[PDB]
Amino acid sequence: SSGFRDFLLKPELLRAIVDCGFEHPSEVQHECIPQAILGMDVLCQAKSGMGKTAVFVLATLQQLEPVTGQVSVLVMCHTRELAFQISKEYERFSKYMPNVKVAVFFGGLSIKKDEEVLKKNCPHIVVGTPGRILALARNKSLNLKHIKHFILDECDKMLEQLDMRRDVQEIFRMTPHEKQVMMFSATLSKEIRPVCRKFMQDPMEIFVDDETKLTLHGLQQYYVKLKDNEKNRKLFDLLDVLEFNQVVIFVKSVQRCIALAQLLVEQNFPAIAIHRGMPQEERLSRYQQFKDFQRRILVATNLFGRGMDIERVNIAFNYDMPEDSDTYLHRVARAGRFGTKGLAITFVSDENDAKILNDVQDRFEVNISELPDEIDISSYI
Amino acid sequence: GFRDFLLKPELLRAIVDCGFEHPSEVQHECIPQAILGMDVLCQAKSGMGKTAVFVLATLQQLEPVTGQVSVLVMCHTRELAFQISKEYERFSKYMPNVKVAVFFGGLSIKKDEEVLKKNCPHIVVGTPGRILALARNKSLNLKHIKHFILDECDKMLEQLDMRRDVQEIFRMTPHEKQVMMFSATLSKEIRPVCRKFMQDPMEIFVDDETKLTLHGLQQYYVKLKDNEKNRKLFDLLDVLEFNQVVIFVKSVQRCIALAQLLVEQNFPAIAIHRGMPQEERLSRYQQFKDFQRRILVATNLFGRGMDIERVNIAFNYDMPEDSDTYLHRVARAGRFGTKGLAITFVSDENDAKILNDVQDRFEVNISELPDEIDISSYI
Amino acid sequence: EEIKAKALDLLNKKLHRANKFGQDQADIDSLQRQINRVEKFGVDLNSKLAEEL
RNA sequence: UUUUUU
């Protein structure tokens, strides 16, 4: 056959990819995987939702030699749900490598469960969030001196945060100096390339520096001008006329997330909410039912703005304007995964809202038409 | 045919104004004799113009004298007295020197004395209780009346309390006068009671009661228990097209509850019954006849006499107590021979016995309600 | 779903009676906007439409 | 019961 055969991956890895239904690699996979399995450090930037996860999952599994009772791979990201998503993704590609063990560690759940996992059934791959991982390392429950692969996803966001940056630096110090380091994101500010660069020796550099190509040309993106009072009524009408399977609606605070979710419910919209402050077991149950297509409407903070891969999200809503063009590009990317078509609607409330939307329009050479009153169902799905 | 009656031209002008083209049977039979001042005991078919008979006959004979009341008309309910008074105004359109007035309870008697002392009418319509009170305190002078009319006379004299009041009012009036009584039902037992008020009167009886039924009415029934009555009515009110309906119940308390429940199903229903303040009763009655509301829930207060043109359906939510009540009640719809619908809820075996009593007595068929009916067949 | 279909029956009667008895046009649209929303989704037990239940 | 000055 053709396609993924070019890499000469392990047969049990290739049998996993077949069961995933994938037919051909994306450009980032073709470019980055063959170098990644050699042990090279990589700094990878590529179009949103184009298969960055499978790059470091397949490459680590390819290079992995399982050692019983010893953690060889560490993968970290900025949100607990993303770490959960990455762990299950590791499980689906290690489907035919029964000896490989994967675990996920994050806060909001008892540390003793994480400790019991480590001391009773030690994994070869650990994914998790910087806080809990660092806590387990200081605990000495998590032995990080056998680490051969150090992976950061959404690395620019993880390193734009100095409190999180120092935590990942403190975690980085307790790992062997000779090991692979790979960092992934769709956004790489020219400011933060050196910050990631300090973590690697002679990395391969995948850059999209000229951001003409960062846009998802399979998405139709519009906007509407309206007051804050008109935001809710316009949202209600749009949710009534537009046909969709699933929708993500982004607000700028926890207060707005809870209030809009409650207001949608009282209008008989089966809306769920996810945000920090929920019990972690509850927001895991709410993340799963959205992923398993048991709820149609999700209201979220920027907690859901990056990396989330939901199969049936057709529309993305900017009920509040994103803080920057970085956050905008990741939120709109929650629809149209792997280049399928979708829809993105942005609310322009005040001066600063139009200020940012003209920035993102200019930065990407994109057209954002004012929203027409009738849209083809063929257009966005 | 109204020309032959030899009425006053203004009176004849009022007849054409309200659109009458041909007199009814009761109008042909009774009007010429009633013009002459003869006592009349009249029974006639429901809604076939008995009111016009004694309104026109008294207006024809009336020789107004500014200080005195000449015609007294009484009936059993306040709203019927109100209806009759506006019927006098309607036929007094071209007789400007004629004054009419209505007196009934539930309104201040001082205002009734005010109209008597300051602008005394020639014709008074009222209910026996208020009329008796005005006559005893001497505000109402009954010594000049020359015409004494009872409408729904059988019901008015079957009530012993009301018969006693009417008798006392009668004894305050001159012996030389015309007395006329009207109803759609005149029992064998009550005819002599009416006759004792009269002297050699013309008698109009319907002894073949099979011709008291309105063959322009479709009459059906449904067998139901009291639990099932509420929503069978709900679906019937949804399915059947109508201009106006009247829904009859057996008590004031049931009238309040059913009306309130109907509004909460967003049927714009109104209720009339005793215990409503009379201003609310009249204003509620007026808007229903003004076509402001479509659904009326009522006790027997509305069970006879009431003349609303667009009542197409009459509902017996509770079984009428006897066959007379059924006859008058069902006749609130299909006025003057027009097409209407009648639906009766039969609750227990006694209700079925009452229904069977009705269809035997009138030789009328009350078939079970079919699942779907034609709009033209009752409109 | 037994709740879903029978919620549609209450609305299909409120809408019917609103038309039959001359309701305000805002009410007609509000009921229809709710009917089509209930078909596109379920019945949320915490919704204010659960007042009738 | 319903209705009839209070």
Add this chain to the structure above:
RNA sequence: UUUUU
């Protein structure tokens, strides 16, 4: 807005 407590 997110990241052990």
